[PDB]
Amino acid sequence: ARQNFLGLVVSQGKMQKTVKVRVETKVFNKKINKELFHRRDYLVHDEGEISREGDLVRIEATRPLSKRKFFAIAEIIRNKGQQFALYESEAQLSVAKEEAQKAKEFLDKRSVRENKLNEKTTLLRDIRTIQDALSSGSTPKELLEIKQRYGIQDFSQETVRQLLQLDISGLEVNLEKQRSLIDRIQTRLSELLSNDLKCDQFLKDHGVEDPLTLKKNIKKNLLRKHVMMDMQQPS
Amino acid sequence: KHPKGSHRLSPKVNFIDVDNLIAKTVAEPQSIKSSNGSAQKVRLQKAELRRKF
RNA sequence: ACAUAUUAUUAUCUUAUUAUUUAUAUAAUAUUUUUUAAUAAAUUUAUUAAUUUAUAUUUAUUUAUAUCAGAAAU
RNA sequence: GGAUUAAAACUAGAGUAGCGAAACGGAUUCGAUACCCGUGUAGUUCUAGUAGUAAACUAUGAAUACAAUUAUUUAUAUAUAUAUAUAUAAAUAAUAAAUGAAAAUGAAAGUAUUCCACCUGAAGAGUACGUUAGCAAUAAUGAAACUCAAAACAAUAGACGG
RNA sequence: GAGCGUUAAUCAUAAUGGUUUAAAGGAUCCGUAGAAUGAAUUAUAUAUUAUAAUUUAGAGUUAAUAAAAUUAAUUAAAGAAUU
RNA sequence: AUAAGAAUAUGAUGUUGGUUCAGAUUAAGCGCUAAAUAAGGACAUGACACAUGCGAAUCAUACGUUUAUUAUUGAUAAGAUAAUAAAUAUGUGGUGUAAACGUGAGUAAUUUUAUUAGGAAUUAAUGAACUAUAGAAUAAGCUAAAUACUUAAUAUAUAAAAAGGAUAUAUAAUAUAUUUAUCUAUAGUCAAGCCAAUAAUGGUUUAGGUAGUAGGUUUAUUAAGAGUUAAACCUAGCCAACGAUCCAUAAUCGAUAAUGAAAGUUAGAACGAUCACGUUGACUCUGAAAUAUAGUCAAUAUCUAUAAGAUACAGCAGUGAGGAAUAUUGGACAAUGAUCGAAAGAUUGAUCCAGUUACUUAUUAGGAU
Ligand SMILES: [K+]
Ligand SMILES: [K+]
Ligand SMILES: [K+]
Ligand SMILES: [K+]
Ligand SMILES: [K+]
Ligand SMILES: [K+]
Ligand SMILES: [K+]
Ligand SMILES: [K+]
Ligand SMILES: [K+]
Ligand SMILES: [K+]
Ligand SMILES: [K+]
Ligand SMILES: [K+]
Ligand SMILES: [K+]
Ligand SMILES: [K+]
Ligand SMILES: [K+]
Ligand SMILES: [Mg+2]
Ligand SMILES: [Mg+2]
Ligand SMILES: [Mg+2]
Ligand SMILES: [Mg+2]
Ligand SMILES: [Mg+2]
Ligand SMILES: [Mg+2]
Ligand SMILES: [Mg+2]
Ligand SMILES: [Mg+2]
Ligand SMILES: [Mg+2]
Ligand SMILES: [Mg+2]
Ligand SMILES: [Mg+2]
Ligand SMILES: [Mg+2]
Ligand SMILES: [Mg+2]
Ligand SMILES: [Mg+2]
Ligand SMILES: [Mg+2]
Ligand SMILES: [Mg+2]
Ligand SMILES: [Mg+2]
Ligand SMILES: [Mg+2]
Ligand SMILES: [Mg+2]
Ligand SMILES: [Mg+2]
Ligand SMILES: [Mg+2]
Ligand SMILES: [Mg+2]
Ligand SMILES: [Mg+2]
Ligand SMILES: [Mg+2]
Ligand SMILES: [Mg+2]
Ligand SMILES: [Mg+2]
Ligand SMILES: [Mg+2]
Ligand SMILES: [Mg+2]
Ligand SMILES: [Mg+2]
Ligand SMILES: [Mg+2]
Ligand SMILES: [Mg+2]
Ligand SMILES: [Mg+2]
Ligand SMILES: [Mg+2]
Ligand SMILES: [Mg+2]
Ligand SMILES: [Mg+2]
Ligand SMILES: [Mg+2]
Ligand SMILES: [Mg+2]
Ligand SMILES: [Mg+2]
Ligand SMILES: [Mg+2]
Ligand SMILES: [Mg+2]
Ligand SMILES: [Mg+2]
Ligand SMILES: [Mg+2]
Ligand SMILES: [Mg+2]
Ligand SMILES: [Mg+2]
């Protein structure tokens, strides 16, 4: 049949309807006693100009098409070259949109900081008026303004404590919950495995059919999936 | 797309029908001609042997 | 340095021959075509030599391109 | 392919104490274009460049896996009845094995794997010619003919040593 | 041995090699090609290769903690001595 | 599967390292020597120049021409006609020389070689010349005549042909029969064109090369693809340090020869395969295929007939030259082939034999006492 080769497109878009395909064949080199790969570039006809540099293609022998062209593209085995072209175009649009959004979020942050620098009022001073007015009874209009600078309509001892909350405090509680879950899951499964009877019951209670007839790994995974379905779904 | 001016498929294999090959190559004389001549008889004998072979 | 021989090349010069392509002929031949003499046969027809007519095939000269080779330069 | 690359050298402009090619003198010597002494120019210094060469040496390319010990430092860690002790790496020193022409190497110059550079008698010769690069000195690349049966390394025993 | 010798030639006769010290490590590193080489498991395939998925022992990124004050370039200073 | 080393360093030793030797061989030469026979080889050099003879002829059953005899005709013999038997290849024709033979100049590959269970454009109304089968073979002209040539007729969009001769018999030139030729068609056989992939010496101290160059589109040309060639219009490519381009050198190869344990290396004389060439260059004709050992023109040399002449020994033998060196100016067509012829036969320096030469191989070249 017509001789067919597999190769990588190494040049495209330089000649009209012609691409350069790199074909590697296996040969034996008697001198060094080693089976080597021999490489050669073929000028190949691309009637539809579909192939792109980087594509893996199969080329088939044809009639003479030019001084040096004797093969044509017969199939695109892998289209990595075509993908590269599509992803580059999308990237230009995708990145422009993201950069525009980030540029607008940077100018907004700058405006807020500038606005705050125009308000001579300082947190300490404001928190020293909400704690003196709340301990003296005075209600100068500054407080009403302060009830707008911060949005704190009510001036109580439990409102300054909520104006000065630090994110670290929330992190400390989320970390304890995370540690609890891990510790509970491990103790639960550890105990369950220690007692085969309580383990068999555990599986049946959660909806396993004849858990007794199961393997150690085929069933410990069920136990693990259940212990993690009784401490993460209920919570 | 295959190259313009080229056949997309390979030419169909030509299978020989031996009955048709024999009929066209070594066809039998259509009539039993009168080979009274000495040279006609020799030619008839040679043609028969060649066709048999 | 150089004096030699050999080969290759060319925006050059000359060029046999050939191919291709131009223009021209009161060009030749055949046929057609228009007439015209001479001759012959018969009692218009044929032949030959001319002229007119187109057609095909050649010929001579001519235009352009390429070309063995030689010259010059490298 | 690229970059960096001692000393000397060169281009331009500053600097110039000391040192110091050269040069000119003083000695030494049979002679002394030397060793020693004097006067001491370039250079040695700085700035901006050129150039890409050294015994540019561990005369030992880089990477990975692996193999028997001791000693000494360093680092990290651990413990305590708190200052040592116990660990794990690195460095260095001396070694086993192994390797090697031996001298020796010793975690490689061992056991293996991968990649690069390089060599094929001496002399001619890192020369000639050409080319490339540089302001230049030069640097890179790099032969052949002729001639010879040499030539070289480690080690051994001597002889000799101002 | 009807040849023998000689000259001219061909093949064989050590790489089942080497490069600290004998010919031979590039001054050094960076890095391109390499038709150079190079991890693990499983499944396919047309099979020491290809593809897909999965993995972290090589190679990297960031941070935390501890440690160190060297090496480049630049700028600003000090010191003994010499003439 | 078959793998050996030796001499030479050094005061001595170990090692590095070259040199030389022991083996086989030749397209061999030379020195000395030499018996017969059988077989295999023989200008590697100047693709230098060549005296002389040969190497390609054959057909009389294509046409024509020339004799003799006999018969008939011709009232005198010049001729004619037919039969018979001869002659003619200095007239017109047919077929044969694209092979074979010789040589290795050119050729490093758009061309050449080798290989592949390769390919398409998806190769002509090509048969070259045999086989099988079927059909056809007509009319004029031109020449002295024809199987010469020319123009027509009819034969698979349809296109595209031809030829008679010899011998008998019967007729009144014609017809049959036999024999040998001619043309067309179909298939077979033999045999052609083109392309791909892979391999094929040295120098980069030849590093850049290319400009129809790389690709696209269209026409012309061809049986047929393609910057293969010619014309036009576009794109800016293509090759290259895994060596481009350039230069030098060389015919290539094997189931051939030599060598080695082998991988290999060498040769390419001999045997065989392939290519190229026939003093040099280009071009054209015929043809399926030729830049043909043809033709045309030119170049170089020679010759005689002095013409827009002939010849070119790389066919055989042979000669001079060159060189260390390579042979008979032999016999025969008996054999195997080739060409012409219907046959009888003719031709054949293909070929087969012999000669010369230890160039190679083999056998023999007296045993017992
Ligand atoms: K084309
Ligand atoms: K100074
Ligand atoms: K050193
Ligand atoms: K290296
Ligand atoms: K060594
Ligand atoms: K000696
Ligand atoms: K030796
Ligand atoms: K001899
Ligand atoms: K005849
Ligand atoms: K000959
Ligand atoms: K040749
Ligand atoms: K007949
Ligand atoms: K080259
Ligand atoms: K010969
Ligand atoms: K014969
Ligand atoms: Mg001209
Ligand atoms: Mg010319
Ligand atoms: Mg200066
Ligand atoms: Mg001095
Ligand atoms: Mg520099
Ligand atoms: Mg130097
Ligand atoms: Mg050096
Ligand atoms: Mg140093
Ligand atoms: Mg590294
Ligand atoms: Mg130099
Ligand atoms: Mg020594
Ligand atoms: Mg003998
Ligand atoms: Mg060997
Ligand atoms: Mg090494
Ligand atoms: Mg080094
Ligand atoms: Mg060195
Ligand atoms: Mg890591
Ligand atoms: Mg010997
Ligand atoms: Mg003989
Ligand atoms: Mg010869
Ligand atoms: Mg006759
Ligand atoms: Mg004749
Ligand atoms: Mg021939
Ligand atoms: Mg007729
Ligand atoms: Mg006639
Ligand atoms: Mg004819
Ligand atoms: Mg005709
Ligand atoms: Mg017709
Ligand atoms: Mg040179
Ligand atoms: Mg074309
Ligand atoms: Mg071309
Ligand atoms: Mg053109
Ligand atoms: Mg030659
Ligand atoms: Mg060979
Ligand atoms: Mg031969
Ligand atoms: Mg050869
Ligand atoms: Mg011969
Ligand atoms: Mg020829
Ligand atoms: Mg010629
Ligand atoms: Mg000729
Ligand atoms: Mg000749
Ligand atoms: Mg001869
Ligand atoms: Mg002589
Ligand atoms: Mg003869």
Side-chain angles (χ1 to χ4, degrees):
Chain A
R2 293 173 185 172
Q3 53 183 283
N4 286 247
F5 297 108
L6 296 156
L8 178 78
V9 177
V10 290
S11 195
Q12 187 273 344
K14 296 182 189 176
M15 289 173 291
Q16 301 179 355
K17 301 193 189 173
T18 319
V19 296
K20 188 183 302 191
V21 179
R22 174 169 297 163
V23 181
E24 282 187 332
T25 54
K26 191 59 132 167
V27 297
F28 184 69
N29 182 325
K30 189 72 177 177
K31 177 188 182 181
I32 55 164
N33 186 59
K34 174 176 176 184
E35 212 192 1
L36 315 169
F37 275 93
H38 274 24
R39 172 204 291 192
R40 190 201 154 184
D41 284 301
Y42 289 65
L43 299 198
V44 179
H45 188 81
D46 195 3
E47 182 63 61
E49 302 195 317
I50 71 190
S51 67
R52 293 295 186 278
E53 294 191 33
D55 288 331
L56 179 64
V57 298
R58 179 168 53 83
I59 69 176
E60 187 172 30
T62 69
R63 67 173 227 266
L65 304 170
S66 70
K67 177 174 184 180
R68 299 190 54 215
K69 296 169 64 176
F70 308 100
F71 290 84
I73 299 293
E75 171 171 353
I76 310 297
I77 306 300
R78 300 187 74 94
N79 63 346
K80 279 173 184 143
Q82 292 166 34
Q83 288 164 29
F84 292 153
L86 178 89
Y87 295 141
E88 180 164 357
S89 298
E90 297 170 356
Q92 186 171 354
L93 301 159
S94 178
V95 171
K97 297 179 177 186
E98 175 182 10
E99 289 305 335
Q101 172 182 12
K102 308 255 206 183
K104 183 178 179 180
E105 294 177 351
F106 177 73
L107 294 171
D108 293 357
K109 288 163 57 184
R110 172 176 297 176
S111 75
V112 171
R113 167 170 289 179
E114 292 169 341
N115 301 333
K116 179 159 188 183
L117 294 157
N118 307 331
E119 302 183 8
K120 295 185 178 181
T121 55
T122 59
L123 175 59
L124 181 68
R125 277 181 175 180
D126 303 1
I127 297 303
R128 182 168 255 181
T129 59
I130 306 153
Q131 285 190 346
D132 291 0
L134 173 59
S135 69
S136 67
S138 65
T139 58
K141 305 316 186 181
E142 75 191 0
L143 304 185
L144 176 60
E145 160 178 41
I146 291 159
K147 131 179 176 183
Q148 305 153 12
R149 303 313 198 80
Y150 300 81
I152 296 282
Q153 181 163 22
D154 305 1
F155 298 66
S156 174
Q157 293 178 336
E158 296 197 0
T159 72
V160 170
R161 195 186 321 284
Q162 315 308 321
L163 276 185
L164 304 175
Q165 292 292 349
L166 302 185
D167 300 349
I168 191 164
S169 296
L171 297 174
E172 187 166 6
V173 176
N174 190 18
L175 271 169
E176 297 161 352
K177 296 172 175 178
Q178 288 178 31
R179 200 198 197 277
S180 297
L181 178 59
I182 298 170
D183 299 321
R184 282 145 46 204
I185 292 165
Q186 294 202 97
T187 53
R188 185 84 204 87
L189 185 48
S190 185
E191 298 164 4
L192 276 160
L193 294 166
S194 307
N195 187 331
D196 296 0
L197 306 186
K198 285 179 189 172
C199 166
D200 195 16
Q201 302 151 30
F202 174 102
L203 291 163
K204 293 181 178 179
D205 306 350
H206 282 106
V208 178
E209 301 179 359
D210 192 0
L212 175 64
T213 63
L214 292 174
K215 320 187 199 162
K216 307 314 188 180
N217 296 16
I218 296 301
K219 182 162 39 182
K220 178 158 175 172
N221 287 8
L222 302 172
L223 297 170
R224 186 183 300 95
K225 179 172 183 177
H226 293 138
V227 171
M228 296 179 76
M229 281 278 182
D230 309 330
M231 298 184 168
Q232 304 190 2
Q233 296 301 321
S235 64
Chain B
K1 305 164 185 172
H2 61 274
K4 172 183 67 180
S6 288
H7 296 67
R8 189 176 182 81
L9 311 187
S10 191
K12 277 189 177 180
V13 169
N14 190 31
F15 288 85
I16 298 167
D17 175 40
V18 171
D19 291 24
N20 178 71
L21 177 69
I22 290 166
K24 287 185 173 187
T25 310
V26 283
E28 292 281 356
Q30 294 186 3
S31 64
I32 294 170
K33 186 175 180 179
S34 53
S35 303
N36 290 337
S38 51
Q40 291 171 353
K41 292 166 174 179
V42 167
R43 278 195 303 272
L44 179 64
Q45 295 174 54
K46 288 193 181 183
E48 180 183 18
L49 189 65
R50 286 185 177 110
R51 173 179 314 101
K52 184 213 299 173
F53 283 172

